[PDB]
Amino acid sequence: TKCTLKSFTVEKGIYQTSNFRVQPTESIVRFPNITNLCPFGEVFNATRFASVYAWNRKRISNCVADYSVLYNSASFSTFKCYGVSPTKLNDLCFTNVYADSFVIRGDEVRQIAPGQTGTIADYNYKLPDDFTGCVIAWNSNNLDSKVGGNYNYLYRLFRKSNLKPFERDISTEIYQAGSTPCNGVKGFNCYFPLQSYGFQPTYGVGYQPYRVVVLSFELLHAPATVCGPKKSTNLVKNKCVNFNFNGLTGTGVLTESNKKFLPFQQFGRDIADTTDAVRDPQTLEILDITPCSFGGVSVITPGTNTSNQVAVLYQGVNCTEVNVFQTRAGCLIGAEHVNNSYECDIPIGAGICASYQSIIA
Amino acid sequence: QCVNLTTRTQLPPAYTNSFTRGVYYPDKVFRSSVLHSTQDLFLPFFSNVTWFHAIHKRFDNPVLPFNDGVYFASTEKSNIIRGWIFGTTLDSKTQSLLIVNNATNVVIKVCEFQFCNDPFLGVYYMESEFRVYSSANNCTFEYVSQPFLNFKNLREFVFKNIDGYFKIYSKHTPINLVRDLPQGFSALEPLVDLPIGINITRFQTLLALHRSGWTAGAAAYYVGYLQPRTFLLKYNENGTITDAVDCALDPLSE
Amino acid sequence: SALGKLQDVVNQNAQALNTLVKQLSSNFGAISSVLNDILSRLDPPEAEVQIDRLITGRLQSLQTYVTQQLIRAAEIRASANLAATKMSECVLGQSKRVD
Amino acid sequence: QIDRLITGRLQSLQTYVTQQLIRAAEIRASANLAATKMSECVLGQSKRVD
Amino acid sequence: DSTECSNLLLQYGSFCTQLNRALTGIAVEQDKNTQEVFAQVKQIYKTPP
Amino acid sequence: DSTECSNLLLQYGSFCTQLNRALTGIAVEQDKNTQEVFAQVKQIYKTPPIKDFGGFNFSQILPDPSKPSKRSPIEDLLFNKVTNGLTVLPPLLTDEMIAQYTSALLAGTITSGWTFGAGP
Ligand SMILES: *[C@@H]1O[C@H](CO)[C@@H](O[C@@H]2O[C@H](CO)[C@@H](O)[C@H](O)[C@H]2NC(C)=O)[C@H](O)[C@H]1NC(C)=O
Ligand SMILES: *[C@@H]1O[C@H](CO)[C@@H](O[C@@H]2O[C@H](CO)[C@@H](O)[C@H](O)[C@H]2NC(C)=O)[C@H](O)[C@H]1NC(C)=O
Ligand SMILES: *[C@@H]1O[C@H](CO)[C@@H](O)[C@H](O)[C@H]1NC(C)=O
Ligand SMILES: *[C@@H]1O[C@H](CO)[C@@H](O)[C@H](O)[C@H]1NC(C)=O
Ligand SMILES: *[C@@H]1O[C@H](CO)[C@@H](O)[C@H](O)[C@H]1NC(C)=O
Ligand SMILES: *[C@@H]1O[C@H](CO)[C@@H](O)[C@H](O)[C@H]1NC(C)=O
Ligand SMILES: *[C@@H]1O[C@H](CO)[C@@H](O)[C@H](O)[C@H]1NC(C)=O
Ligand SMILES: *[C@@H]1O[C@H](CO)[C@@H](O)[C@H](O)[C@H]1NC(C)=O
Ligand SMILES: *[C@@H]1O[C@H](CO)[C@@H](O)[C@H](O)[C@H]1NC(C)=O
């Protein structure tokens, strides 16, 4: 009070000196129930993969993509992400996800990167320099190699020009290396472009089949719908917490509500357009958001010439949320309530007055 | 597969009064016993809405400009109206949106379709005729959902394209009026928001033929256009919109 | 409409409080009216500017509210002084003042 | 540019409205005094000095 | 008459409604003042000829 | 609850202190207004139990013993006919005590004339 009044002597009276703030204790982040996961089983766990030339492209939209399941797996030898980091993949959201799947050799995994060169990048699968996404590769000698030789996997070895980024060439036209026309016959100087990798189990680690899935993340002006899973912190009621319900954030006490919402409605507003009711996304129940018990802190004191005893009034604050007496004005601490009636010396409010005789109210 | 329909009877389109229909919830916010003034794409009260018929020989399936939004009213019995055609050029050059309700479910697709000049479905007296497209090349979005659906049923729909979001609001109403729109109040609940992100400037209704040539089942529908204006909506104790005021209709409502 | 004078004061105070609450929903030229959205969507060099715009808009609203409350307080004080004069002169005595 | 002009003109208009409210309060006090003089000096004889 | 100016002005909220309400209150207050001062009789008295 | 907003708000100085002090002055002014209007007597007068006033009836303005609020029927009708950092401070005098002050004034002006306003 001396600090507020800028004086070392305080006259008898009540002085509003501060404000009592209930501090938020927990953070409650409830978003919708985790449903509709992205089809990563039909990409990674596919029974057969495509060749590098006719590489499969699967467009992934309108689902929840959990990338930590992929990142924490021990079955992948390469999980190199270009243009984004794996830790924040699970938080960001993308418009569409392109999953390109193919089989290449062990020594050819390095060529699936921005800015690289080789047969695969020049003639089979070319990645842009400005590529945002992840390259995931794992050994598949168990499935894609047979003892006689698996000749179901093919690669382009010849083309007149290099491929553009994200281009597919499935043409089986005879490559013309000379001035002479090929005329469809694999004679002198005219070779067939697509050659096969004879994948056998007894091969070296640089020649064994590797299944590669390249995920391409783009953000376009359309609404982004491939989002990562959002966790749901265990709801805490009857405490002043910071709530985040479906992107609506605030601070309040969440209590049970008797308001019956219509099924399409999620939040509740009063006359002054402030959110006072909300629907929990996990469990369809209605919660009232009562603002935390902020109040004024007033100091009731006699003159410093008389005594140094003080009392504290918390305006509009119940006594259970802070010589403690409950008044309609608020909670009064430090004053002894008496049943006798005297003249008003220091006004408290709601018919309550304080006086010095100790401090009585 | 496409089939030209050449047994139509030429007739000018009709017009009628909107009364106090076309109101929808502007947001997902509960409000109790309060009056809320909102600025949004709303249908004007007592406005001139275009009336199209399907009767036998009338088969009204034209292509109309979408403008800023579409209010679709349907005085429907026996489920003739099944879906809508949304797009800009309605060919494979651009990307178009298809809404269909067949005998099992509702399918919403955003793809590069080649639309027929006369697209329709068909019921044989069993649904065994689908002639609405010839191709589907590049799909961006697919969504299969639960089915939305004297004239006995009244179906109100509001379609909006805001910030790449397609809002479909709908309401089912049990009526017993024979010919025109009934006079009353019914606020349209929000049904589904679609992340489409595409340009739409034209639309076309999809009907169903009756085969036993073809016969058109008795149906009637109404097209209204959404304009940016202010409504004063009344919310009761239970939180439903029971009445509305158009701020630009007359000085009393102003 | 017998008690319209008290009802006008109650309605004016409630409407002024409601307007002061509804001024929080205005961005005042900023990208959003919510401080959390600005603090989560932008870096502090531009969030400082947006928060400054929200601060000056809300401060102008609060100054306007306090000024009109002071004017209404002066009016109510004048009415209360008149009421005290009527209490002293009409109730506690007989007044010769006409009307 | 319109934001600068809007905030300047809005501050000017708010200042004008505040001055008008203060002057209206003064004129209301003067009018209440004039009504009191009309009641007590014209419609009756007043014993109040000056 | 600038529509862009009004669109930017709507971001500031209901300041204009407040100012119009205050001016309307002053305008009706002036008529109330004249009514209180001069209309203290409901009978129009006339002097004899 | 934004700490960055408060840090930027501290650059503007003591505007908040001026606004709080002005509102505090208005709030104490309302209590002073009520004190000046209703608390003009320091003796709480009561009417006699027998209401023999020479034919004059004051039941509509005297407090009703049947009502818990101790208001007059006219005062009861008057009370029936009136219907983010924000706090509402309660008035210093409750409605019961303001009704008690009006009851004391009515008892004084009925039983004692204008004598109670000028002395005993
Ligand atoms: C149904 O009628 C429409 C309208 O004439 C036909 O659309 C025309 O198709 C021809 C195909 O050679 C085009 O050259 C015309 O430009 C089209 N006209 C319009 C207005 O689109 C449609 O082909 C007919 N259906 C069938 C199956 O013949
Ligand atoms: C004074 O007036 C009151 C009210 O006008 C009278 O009370 C009424 O008495 C009659 C006769 O029993 C009842 O029928 C009414 O219902 C009473 N009115 C109320 C409001 O209670 C009262 O009798 C009058 N006289 C005295 C001496 O008190
Ligand atoms: C693919 O197979 C592995 C090996 O059993 C399994 O652990 C994993 O869950 C499967 N699915 C995905 C999406 O990786
Ligand atoms: C959400 O999932 C939980 C189980 O994790 C289930 O008990 C609850 O009913 C679900 N709620 C909805 C709305 O689906
Ligand atoms: C509706 O429009 C048609 C032509 O578009 C016009 O003839 C008719 O009078 C209009 N009705 C009303 C009520 O405006
Ligand atoms: C309706 O369409 C969906 C999607 O094309 C299809 O799966 C379903 O079998 C169809 N039902 C009928 C009855 O045609
Ligand atoms: C769209 O389809 C055409 C042919 O159907 C194809 O040539 C083109 O590459 C496709 N574009 C995209 C973006 O898929
Ligand atoms: C949408 O389509 C219309 C008609 O084709 C065209 O005029 C308009 O420019 C298009 N808008 C966009 C954003 O492509
Ligand atoms: C709300 O609904 C209940 C029954 O569901 C009904 O009794 C009550 O009257 C309704 N309230 C309003 C304001 O319509």
Swiss-Prot record, chain F:
Effect seen on changing N20K: In strain: Omicron/BA.1, Omicron/BA.2, Omicron/BA.2.12.1, Omicron/BA.2.75, Omicron/BA.4, Omicron/BA.5, Omicron/BQ.1.1, Omicron/XBB.1.5, Omicron/EG.5.1
Chain positions carrying an annotated carbohydrate: N57
Residues with site note (Cleavage): R71, S72
Function: Precursor of the fusion protein processed in the biosynthesis of the S protein and the formation of virus particle. Mediates fusion of the virion and cellular membranes by functioning as a class I viral fusion protein. Contains two viral fusion peptides that are unmasked after cleavage. The S2/S2' cleavage occurs during virus entry at the cell membrane by host TMPRSS2 or during endocytosis by host CSTL.
Record's protein name: Spike protein S2
Source organism per UniProt: Severe acute respiratory syndrome coronavirus 2 (2019-nCoV)
Full-protein interval shown: 745 to 892 of 1273
